[PDB]
Amino acid sequence: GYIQGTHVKTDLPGPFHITMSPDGSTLFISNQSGHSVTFVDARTQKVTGEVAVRVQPEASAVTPDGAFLYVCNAESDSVSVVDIQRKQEIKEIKVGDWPSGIKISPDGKTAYVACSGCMWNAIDVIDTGRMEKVRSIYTSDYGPRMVEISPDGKTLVAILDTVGSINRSVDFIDIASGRVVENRVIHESSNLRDVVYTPDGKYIAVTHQTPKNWLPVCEAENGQVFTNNVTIIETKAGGKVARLPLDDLNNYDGNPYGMAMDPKGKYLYIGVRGMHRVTILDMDKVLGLVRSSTQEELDYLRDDLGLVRDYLVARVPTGLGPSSVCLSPDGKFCYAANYFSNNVTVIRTAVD
Amino acid sequence: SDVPYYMQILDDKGMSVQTALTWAYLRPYHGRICSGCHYGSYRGRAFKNIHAKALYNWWYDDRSHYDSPFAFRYLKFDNDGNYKGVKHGEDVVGPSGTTSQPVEGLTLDKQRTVDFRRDIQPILDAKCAMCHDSNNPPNLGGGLELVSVDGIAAYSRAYNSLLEPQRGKDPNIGGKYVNPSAAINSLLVWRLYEAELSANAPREKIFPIEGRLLHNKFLTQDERYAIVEWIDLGAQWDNIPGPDFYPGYLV
Ligand code: HEC
Ligand code: HEC
Ligand SMILES: [Ca+2]
Ligand SMILES: [Ca+2]
Ligand SMILES: [Cl-]
Ligand SMILES: [Mg+2]
């Protein structure tokens, strides 16, 4: 396999992503440098097979029944359909540039694919019966990184990570309508790597960074150049956009990427790729902070470098480059995919 | 007498403007004078010459030890909620004729206090908790069920909410909604009376310009002033000394 963006060959799989079957018996790891997907049994923690897909898979989504795995092949500009029981790819559907993420509708009748190409704005829809790409939903700006579907399945959020932009936004889509209802801007943001929904569907979490671009590059202290943040957006009309710090004064979480939401909405799990660790936060303290604060107070609290300690549950040691995380349906275990270490860290959560 | 006590001067709404924080005690039959309220007559200053109306309410009868009135149990307010006067309680009393005034408040058994579980919390459940849940701070719901905080379950949700600290404010002064031993400085009381009561503002944004709801008519005078008394007393939870039947810490 090839290292991404290069013609240099490597024997290492380089896991870029991870997910789990809705019955929680199987983990599917997308190997970016392996051009395949690794199957792992949850109970035995054993590799049960490796299924070949197209070039550079960065993402995968499982059907509600768990008979199929839709893998995003980024370099191939395509999406592979994998038979989970047969351990074989049965089709390749062609999509827009660089799918970086994919998710299946609650009814399992539709798959949504975010095309992350820098000049590309698209979310391609795919019927599961036809196993084919129906149409494309054009976003408000370029580079959707990932999508997410609400628990009621009538709405689709898409993080737009837009190159050359200080203000990067999130699009709200009406699934039945298939068009953009609203666009909400996260001010002073860059590198949006994920978006998740709360189980009640009243909030979304988005991991990103806050650059200070208008300032001289002088020191590294007090986040003069970059700070690392998680933003909670209230899904109601006119809802708050709350940018919250992930960093201590002398301790920062470099490049937050993947997110896993507790099934009951108790905790938030964040893969920290630069600092090689999983940051676990208390979501009732976070949401409690959001509900009890105005927009002004939250905007002031974004730069509070002692604030995290209020809602911070833990920071757990991981392998190198934990780009993605996922949870078991009972929420008692969190898995983190490590690219450089070529492995998966298994974490016992606070849930008992 | 022979018991620790202190005093609070009150305005026409019945709230403490200034609290004397210390422990004073009277020996039997003794009586004690002071020029003013921490004026310095008992510290660094000479007594100011003052001809006071109270001097003639003290002892005017030769067949009595003292003709001064005993501390009244309750208050009377007008329709506006302003101070009408003082009101006798049930504790009224061998006994001999050695004083002119009715004998009130000498029974330690019957001495009244305000307990959050017995008094305030039911008022909160009845008139408040309906519109105040997790989604509308402060959170007054949940009843008397104890809330575990840092591995310790002591008080309920409403108490934890109301006693919550505020950023940039000395907790010795007060929290978000409550200033202990000043009700007049408490945002909660500010809202319950829908007015600016004191010269110390609890915070910068007090009354919302959008979606505001008038809270002054939600409670009767007795309930509201029960809250006032509770806060002026120091806003305790368990005001009944020793273990009792009311909800609280148990292991
Ligand atoms: C529904 C009719 C309500 C009842 C019953 C109670 N409250 Fe309320 N409260 C309600 C709303 C819609 C709001 C929004 C802000 C506003 O000023 O209208 C509030 C707010 C408060 C506040 C202020 C909170 C803050 O500014 O941080 C307090 C202190 C408060 N409410 C207390 C309170 C009490 C003591 C109640 C029982 C008498 C009560 N509320 C009932 C709606 C409703
Ligand atoms: C208004 C309330 C009063 C009145 C009616 C009296 N005092 Fe005094 N007192 C008062 C304050 C604000 C304080 C200080 C509180 C604090 O520091 O937090 C005090 C203090 C005392 C003390 C302690 C020693 C001192 O601070 O000087 C004593 C003793 C004391 N007060 C006695 C006292 C006497 C004899 C009074 C005459 C009835 C009296 N107090 C009334 C305020 C107030
Ligand atoms: Ca491409
Ligand atoms: Ca007690
Ligand atoms: Cl004095
Ligand atoms: Mg330096």
Curated annotation (Swiss-Prot), chain A:
Gene Ontology CC entries for this record: anammoxosome
Natural source organism: Kuenenia stuttgartiensis
Conditions for induction: Is among the most highly expressed proteins in the proteome.
Chief subcellular location: other
Quaternary structure annotation from Swiss-Prot or TrEMBL: Part of the hydrazine synthase complex that forms an elongated dimer of heterotrimers composed of one alpha, one beta and one gamma subunit.
Pathway: Nitrogen metabolism
Tagged with keyword Signal: yes
Annotated Gene3D superfamilies: YVTN repeat-like/Quinoprotein amine dehydrogenase
Protein name (record): Hydrazine synthase subunit beta
Described function: Component of the hydrazine synthase complex that catalyzes the condensation of nitric oxide (NO) with ammonium to form hydrazine. The beta subunit may play a role in modulating transport of the hydroxylamine intermediate through a tunnel between the gamma and alpha subunit's active site.
PANTHER family in the record: DIHYDRO-HEME D1 DEHYDROGENASE, PROTEIN NIRF
Keywords: Signal
From Swiss-Prot, chain B:
Domain Cytochrome c span(s) in chain numbering: 84-235
Subcellular location: Anammoxosome
Predominant localisation class: other
A GO CC annotation given for this chain: anammoxosome
Binding-site residues, heme 2: 128, 131-132, 215
Induction (record text): Is among the most highly expressed proteins in the proteome.
Assigned keywords, A-Z: Heme, Iron, Metal-binding, Oxidoreductase, Signal, Zinc
Residues given in the record as Zn(2+) binding sites: 38
Residues involved in heme 1 binding: 34, 37, 42
A GO MF label: metal ion binding
Functional summary from the UniProt entry: Component of the hydrazine synthase complex that catalyzes the condensation of nitric oxide (NO) with ammonium to form hydrazine. The alpha subunit catalyzes the second half-reaction, i.e. the condensation of hydroxylamine formed in the active site of the gamma subunit with ammonia, yielding hydrazine.
Subunit structure: Part of the hydrazine synthase complex that forms an elongated dimer of heterotrimers composed of one alpha, one beta and one gamma subunit.
Comment, domains: The alpha subunit consists of three domains: an N-terminal domain which includes a six-bladed beta-propeller, a middle domain binding a pentacoordinated c-type heme and a C-terminal domain which harbors a bis-histidine-coordinated c-type heme.
Protein name: Hydrazine synthase subunit alpha
Organism: Kuenenia stuttgartiensis
Whole-protein residues included: 550 to 808 of 809
